Design a protein around this ligand. Sequence first.
Ligand SMILES: Nc1ncnc2c1ncn2[C@@H]1O[C@H](COP(=O)(O)CP(=O)(O)OP(=O)(O)O)[C@@H](O)[C@H]1O
Ligand SMILES: [Zn+2]
Ligand SMILES: [Zn+2]
Lengths: 203, 214, 56, 286, 119, 30, 49, 98, 56, 56
Amino acid sequence: YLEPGHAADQEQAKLIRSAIEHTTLKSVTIASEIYYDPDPRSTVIPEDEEIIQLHFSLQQSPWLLRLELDRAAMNDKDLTMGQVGERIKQTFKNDLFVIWSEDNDEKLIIRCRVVAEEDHMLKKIENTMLENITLRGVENIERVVMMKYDRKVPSPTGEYVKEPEWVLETDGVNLSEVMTVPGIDPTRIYTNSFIDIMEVLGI
Amino acid sequence: DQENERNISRLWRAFRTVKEMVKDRGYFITQEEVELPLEDFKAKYCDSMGRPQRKMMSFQANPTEESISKFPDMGSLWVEFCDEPSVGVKTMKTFVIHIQEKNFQTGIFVYQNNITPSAMKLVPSIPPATIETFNEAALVVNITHHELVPKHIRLSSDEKRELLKRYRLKESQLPRIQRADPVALYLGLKRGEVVKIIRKSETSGRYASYRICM
Amino acid sequence: DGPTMREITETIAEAKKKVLDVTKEAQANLLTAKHGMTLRESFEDNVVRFLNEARD
Amino acid sequence: FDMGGYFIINGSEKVLIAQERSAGNIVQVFKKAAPSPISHVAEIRSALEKGSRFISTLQVKLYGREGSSARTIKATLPYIKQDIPIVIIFRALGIIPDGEILEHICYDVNDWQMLEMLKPCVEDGFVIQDRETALDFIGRRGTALGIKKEKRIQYAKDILQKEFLPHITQLEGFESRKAFFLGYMINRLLLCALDRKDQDDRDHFGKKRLDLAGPLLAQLFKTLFKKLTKDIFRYMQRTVELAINAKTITSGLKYALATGNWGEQKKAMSSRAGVSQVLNRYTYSS
Amino acid sequence: TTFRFCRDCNNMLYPREDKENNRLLFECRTCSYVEEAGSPLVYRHELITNIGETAGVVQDIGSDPTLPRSDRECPKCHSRENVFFQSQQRRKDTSMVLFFVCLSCSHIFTSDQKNKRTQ
Amino acid sequence: SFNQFVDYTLQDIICEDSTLIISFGKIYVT
Amino acid sequence: TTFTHCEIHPSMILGVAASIIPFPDHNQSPRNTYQSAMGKQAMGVFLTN
Amino acid sequence: SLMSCISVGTDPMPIITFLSEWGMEPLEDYVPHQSPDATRVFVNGVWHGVHRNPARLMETLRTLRRKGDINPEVSMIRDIREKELKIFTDAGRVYRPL
Amino acid sequence: HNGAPHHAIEEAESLLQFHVATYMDNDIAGQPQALQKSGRPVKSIRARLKGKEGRI
Amino acid sequence: LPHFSKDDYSPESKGFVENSYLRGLTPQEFFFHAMGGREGLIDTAVKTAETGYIQR
DNA sequence: CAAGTACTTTTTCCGGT
RNA sequence: AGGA
DNA sequence: AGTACTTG
Ligand SMILES: Nc1ncnc2c1ncn2[C@@H]1O[C@H](COP(=O)(O)CP(=O)(O)OP(=O)(O)O)[C@@H](O)[C@H]1O
Ligand SMILES: [Zn+2]
Ligand SMILES: [Zn+2]
């Protein structure tokens, strides 16, 4: 249940929807590839030549990790390449060198290079990425839905009047966290798992 | 600016809830003190770069006038906020003897991420005084405020004596509240302490239950 | 009634078209999947719903 | 009007109720559930038409979960404890170089997708590099073990001959025939794993056989005729130098058909009961 | 991807980097064989796969009676004789888009009123 | 099914692994 | 136009018990599963001998 | 059902002999990358080999049964898509006349 | 009491333990069920008291 | 059913019984009604036990 | 350590192998 | 094996 | 059909 004010605010509803519904790098990816691109300043891939030109102007591994992201998926689950990349960038910190094609650019690509024996290590980094990286939402919370539940409320004139509100239905449970989220009513929140309610809110 | 702004809001939220809990326990706290705005909290406890200085937050609380009538031996409380995400045996022993000397009755320790099992071994160290651990993250939202959460009320040793006399009970016979119950934690319920629970009823309009502590 | 039977017979016929319409649409990739549903899950819900609307 | 199709056992009309069963010698792939190490399994319940009837089932398993690093294909062999990586079995069959092993599994030299999935199996079975060291590796893992170098290699030979994929052949030199089938199983396994084919319907009537009065009797008769065989041996042995018990056959048939307990004998469970029942005669239709 | 094998062994080839001349090789780990890489691509994942949509389109696709027929003219030969089916890729997500196979030239075309293919 | 058992299957079981150090020829059903 | 075979009669999908039911295509399916179990509790001539 | 029957159980050998003498490559001799799309032939889940033109083969086997030469209770299926021709001489299979 | 062939005692002891075990409970984890000469197993005292049908 | 062409999603193929009991059912309609009906008889048989023990 | 295993209460009350 |  | 239990 949304914050007391924003009842009919469908946009506030969409905001929490995105802020709580869990998204992983796997969900957005089309395919991941491993290339031997030895010179980092030049590129065997001609498409990427453009991306190198900019993510350079305004020491590392010769082995490349190149993953193509889906446009349509980066939409229903609103996403910027910048915010996707920044996640990867913030996971491996300074053990990985990350470059990415712009939101405008025709194909959506993320170029990764590491800081004897390599081939296997990069194929390990790809699972640590697809499976182990979260972009949006909270863990255990899946397919979040927007609902316009009908609510009865006393009017200024005193009569009980139909004043419906925007509500969110989850397809997973994590009470401990969704409560702390800004923009909700942590006084009205309810989960069908009562085992959880007793744990968080008392017997 | 970035996303530093959220951890600021979250710390202030957690603070309000501590102020709320302390008032509720039976300590002299103002309504103006609880409802202190986000803007006021910033310019009070934030350094030269607007980063929250938790060492400043730490406060002392004295019983309300009313509290000394029901619970006379209710001493003063110490609330300690630490700036280290992991609290070590070094900073713990500081606060432990702080209570022992200032002769406090109770003491709350609000930590960010963890408390080392080294520091945790010093909690029952200073009797009759008592210590309480509290994860800041849990304190963001006051559970007591929830729809489903009724008014729990701690009973005086004489009130429990009467409750049992009046209902012809043995301590066994009463419903139990676990010592680790969020509400038994909020009120700092001790073993044997009884709560009077007042819930609304679709049946009678008002129903009074009782729960003994574990 | 014969007229009530005509009316019922044509009620089913229109529902069967409404279904075929969504069927040609989904085979031509034009269907827009409902948030939190397969493209198919979306279609079947619609088909099942038109058929039940009709039965009633 | 009486139709027959029933027996008369000690004056009562006994009926043999047709017993449903899952058909034998059939390759089927099933997606093994979410909290399992194995993600997909190729099963084949291989039995001989007649000849002791081996209930030996071959399990070609795809280890590792969806999105887990190192997804290997291992197979469970009759009278072998551990799950042998496919490659070793091929090497134990004589198919030694990877590529000749890969030819048996993936039929298209173009399909990279399936081949990428086979790279780990090659990496697993890399240690063993000849037919000999492959039979020793299988021989090492018993059964129990049966300690002796010459012994274990001599065993795995017999298991693959007599026990592994016992339909096709139980005979000697047929290594190529069995190896192309194992490859057909691994192909059917990966086809399902790469979402190209469907998980087999364990509820398809075509994959089910109803055992009627005849085969039911044969199962019983074979059990009994081999029980008469051991009695013939006992009389021959005692004759340290024409009395062969006809009761055993008569009685056993009479017992099972009377009791409905399709087993041996008054000492039944686990056997199979409810098979033979008394013919309903309330109505002709009944 | 499309990978090679070692001549002499037949055993599969593993990558090796030639740091000195910055080039990819493929060593045999059974014998001493080595050969330069054809492509700079070593591994491909493919999460949103499309390979297996038009499997088993054997020229006998017409002889299956179980298959439905349509009166859609071929994009190539303009023949109104075709056998159609849905994406033979057995995933939940999959769209209902049809694949038509000509009963004269045997060219494959869709009902996809969004995308222009060649498979 | 029963007829198949008597006419064929019975003769199979009678001599599939029968022979003992004593073999079994044709079977007769009265 | 692809028909390989034809159905001899669609009432042959039914077994002995269901086959005695008049107009079963005019009944709710379980009512037939019912009658298919009752005719076994009926009475009549079971054999002439 | 009234029309259903069960397969009594026939001998595979005359079919196995027939298939080989009708263009069947034995599995022992098969070479996957030479003959690629060859329809693979099975007789009771026993892979006997491959055949280059199943269309002709399916027709010969179908018309053999339909004449009476192949036992009528024997079932033979041609999955063109999967490229398989499976035959069942098997006992216990429930069938219906059409 | 008589000629004690040391092992022959730990033998007869383990059998007595078995009988006094299977008398009170026949349906034990350690599989060998005490079966009456007929194959049918012996009715334990525990078996007499076990739920729905039987004493309680 | 084998009386339908492949990849048929039409109401008639997926089991929509267009006819009334007064009018009678087609063989396809009949068998589909049968599949559905049998599902009820199974869930009564299953639940009737679960439900009894809940009460206990 | 985990998977896959056994048991268990697994609805009630009413002719005879 | 049947009955509500 | 589920749950603590049990054994690999
Ligand atoms: N296995 C069982 N256990 C306990 N009670 C049962 C039972 N089976 C049937 N009953 C009882 O018998 C009653 C009648 O069920 P049925 O004989 O099948 C006719 P019905 O289902 O009630 O539909 P109807 O009144 O429109 O004809 C049930 O409501 C129930 O109380
Ligand atoms: Zn080599
Ligand atoms: Zn054409």
